[PDB]
Amino acid sequence: TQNVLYENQKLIANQFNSAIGKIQDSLSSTASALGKLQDVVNQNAQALNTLVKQLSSNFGAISSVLNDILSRLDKGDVDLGDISGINASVVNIQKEIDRLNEVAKNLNESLIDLQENVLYENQKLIANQFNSAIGKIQDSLSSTASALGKLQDVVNQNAQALNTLVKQLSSNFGAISSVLNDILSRLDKV
Amino acid sequence: YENQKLIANQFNSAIGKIQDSLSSTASALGKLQDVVNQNAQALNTLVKQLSSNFGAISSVLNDILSRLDKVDVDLGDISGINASVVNIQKEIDRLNEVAKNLNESLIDLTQNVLYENQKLIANQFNSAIGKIQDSLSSTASALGKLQDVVNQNAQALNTLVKQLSSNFGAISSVLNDILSRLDKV
């Protein structure tokens, strides 16, 4: 009956509007988190590239001093592998962040403001199109999560390699410092 | 009513699909925050450890230079280099409440005005669904590209570490041969 037909429209409208407002907040939150990740990723890329450049300069400085010692002892040439080829890439997802913020705003226009057969067949078609697109989107999110687990392993491997480097340095250079200490007590300063 | 039923179901079906996409989005964002911050802490550890070793190598070179002659050293300070960390927990949490809270928005139950109202309801739902699907597509695009680069910089970090291991091996090896030559005279 007539009132039930309008009152329903009010429920469909009130519920739908509630979902839009919530979805808008989620879209803004996704845009905010994406922008923050973009920033720290690119900052960290620049920290690494600054590190590599300064290490090259420092290794050359060690290389020069060693040869001077060697030629002094003589009275050879040493090279250390260049690490200049190591480069950290930057990421650019600004276009996606913009679309998210744009649709977040666009949804204001999709809210239902009610006035106080063919359509059904057309409606069957639109949902199918959405179901096909939302499926491809969900598949992309799944494979990305799989890449994120594969990534966790890789970050663990260089956590291992980093600790291995640390102890190799403490062992080699601590031992040199002790051995040199005994040679220095035996020899006279120039 | 038949159209009223059809839209009410289609909505409910799509809300659930959105919910799952929101939950995977918070999940990928949570994983990214962790490996980004781990990779950041590794970089800062490497900087700190290298600075200490460059200082140790610096004193060792000058000490050797003070006992040989006639044929000064401070290495550049890299301790200022810092990798910042990220905090997006508030955004990830909000993504999770909204995905759960979408349960509340689910539904169950002249003649030109109602016909015009249903025409409006269908068109707004269709336009919003199309807009949301496009934004989720953008979210997926950004997450894959984010994974992509953080992986490349993790691999670059790994190759840097293994190159560093050889360079400091070569330095150490040369220093030990210099020590034995000095020991002899």
Numbering used by the authors:
A (entry chain A): 1 to 75, 82 to 122, 135 to 208
B (entry chain B): 6 to 76, 83 to 120, 133 to 208
What is written in the article reporting this PDB entry?
The spike (S) protein mediates SARS-CoV-2 entry by binding its S1 subunit to the host receptor angiotensin-converting enzyme 2 (ACE2), and subsequently promoting viral and cellular membrane fusion by its S2 subunit, leading to the release of viral genome into the cytoplasm. The S2 subunit contains two important domains, heptad repeat 1 (HR1) and heptad repeat 2 (HR2), which are highly conserved among coronaviruses. Subsequently, three HR2 peptides move backward in an antiparallel manner and fold into the three surface grooves of the HR1 trimeric α-helical inner core, thus forming an irreversible six-α-helical bundle (6-HB) structure that maintains close contact between viral and cellular membranes and promotes membrane fusion. We designed a recombinant protein HR121 from SARS-CoV-2, which could highly mimic the conformation of the HR1 trimeric inner core in the fusion intermediate of the S2 subunit.
